[PDB]
C-alpha cells in the first residue's frame, strides 16, 4: 500500500504506531524485571 | 599604415601571419632597443612595424636571418 512516501517523518510515525501503550501495570512489571536482572548480575 | 593595412596583407598573405610578424618586430623595436629602418615621423612602434613590412624590408625570413646572425656573432665572442 506504501505510496512511496519518501517523507522520513511518515516512516517514523508508521514504525512507531505499531507498539501500543500500557500503563500503571507494565511500568511496574518492566521495572521489576530490570531490577531483577541487575540483582542477578 | 595608419588608415588601412591592405598592402601589408597583400605582401605577406594571411592576415594572421601579418599580425604575428609585425608583433614580434614591434616588440623588438620597443624593448630590444633596435633602430627603425624607415623614418620615425612620430609614430608608435606598431605603425612603424607595419610601414616596414609594407615596403618589403621586414618579413619572417629576414627576421630569422637577422636573429641567427646576431646569435652566431654573440656566441663567437
Amino acid at each position: 500500500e506504501i505510496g512511496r512516501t519518501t517523507d522520513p517523518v511518515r516512516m517514523y510515525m508508521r514504525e512507531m504506531g505499531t507498539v501500543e501503550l500500557l500503563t500503571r501495570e507494565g511500568e511496574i512489571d518492566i521495572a521489576k524485571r530490570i531490577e531483577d536482572g541487575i540483582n542477578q548480575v | 599604415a595608419r588608415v588601412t593595412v591592405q598592402d601589408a596583407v597583400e605582401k605577406i598573405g594571411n592576415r594572421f601571419d601579418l599580425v604575428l610578424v609585425a608583433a614580434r618586430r614591434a616588440r623588438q623595436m620597443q624593448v630590444g632597443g633596435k633602430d627603425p629602418l624607415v623614418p620615425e615621423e612620430n609614430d608608435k612602434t606598431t605603425v612603424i612595424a607595419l610601414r616596414e613590412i609594407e615596403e618589403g624590408l621586414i618579413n619572417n625570413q629576414i627576421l630569422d636571418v637577422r636573429e641567427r646572425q646576431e646569435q652566431q656573432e654573440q656566441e663567437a665572442a
Binding site: 500500500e1 506504501i2 505510496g3 511518515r10 508508521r14 504506531g17 | -
Partner: protein, 50 residues
Amino acid sequence: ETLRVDPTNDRLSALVEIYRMMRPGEPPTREAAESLFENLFFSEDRYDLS
C-alpha cells in the same frame, strides 16, 4: 461508463481512496478519512466562497 470503470463499491472504500490519494503512505483509519473529507470541503473555517 464511469461507474463501470469505478473500482470503489461503498462509501467507506471511497473515503479510503480519497484519503490515500491526499496523504499517501498512511494507514486509512475510519475517523481519519471522515475528518479529512469534512474538513476538506464542508467545514466553516477551512473553505469559504465569499
